[PDB]
């Protein structure tokens, strides 16, 4: 299942645009003001705002500036954040539930090729009757 | 299963350490540079955060200085609690919500073996009355 996690995957990465992108929103529509230059453009602040997950090497001039943003940094990292474990608990939960049903699963094809089995000696018994 | 539970727990405390250690680097990132004693190597960080959670009485010799010299630190620590204590409540309430399926399936389980075993009944009925004209 190269075809369970595409679909799947494509989901998880457009939730992932609209999350960041929401908070891209925000982020540009109260620090855009005065900090254009990486939060000018939507996407711009959406890149800063991913920089900032992404950790490499901002926010303290936007926080000195501007007090009270930890109220957005802080909650949207959260977020994020939560999504992130959220997703990753779920396939985990969801695929233990999926191992539990694996001895159903061999009990099956015991039934399903034992049925099979007679039906063909039946046949043949009865196929030797002509 | 004894082995439902085993390939299970391990992704479960293969993501604690994800989030620990991820937590470990930040913590280590920003702290390590005034507190090295026991912010100091990244395991050394991240010791002291699991021993934040476990809350062992030296927690509280810990965060207070730390919190004073930095202030704004409790915008680490506490979203950082939050996250593992989301991460560990997520988990039980799946296993919850996904358990209480599973249950709500077993009566389908039992009917599934009545046709089963009724089935197989019959073919051996139907054998024995065949294989019994020759």
């Given at each position: 299942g190269f075809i369970t996690?595409?679909?799947?995957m494509a989901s998880v990465?457009?939730?992932m645009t609209i999350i960041f992108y929401i908070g891209a929103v925000i982020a540009t529509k109260l620090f855009?003001?005065?900090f254009p230059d990486w939060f000018g453009?939507?996407?711009l602040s959406a890149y800063t705002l991913f920089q900032i997950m992404t950790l490499d090497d901002i926010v303290r001039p936007v926080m000195?500036?501007?007090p009270y943003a930890w109220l957005f940094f802080v909650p949207f990292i959260m977020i994020?954040?939560?999504?992130v474990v959220n997703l990753l608990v779920g396939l985990i939960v969801n695929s233990m539930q999926d191992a539990h049903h694996a001895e159903d699963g061999e009990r099956t094809?015991?039934?399903r090729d034992e049925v099979l089995?007679?039906?063909?000696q039946i046949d043949q018994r009865l196929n030797a009757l002509g």
């Open positions: 996690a595409l679909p799947g990465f457009l939730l855009a003001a005065s453009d939507l996407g000195q500036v501007y994020t954040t939560f999504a094809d015991a039934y089995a007679r039906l063909e």
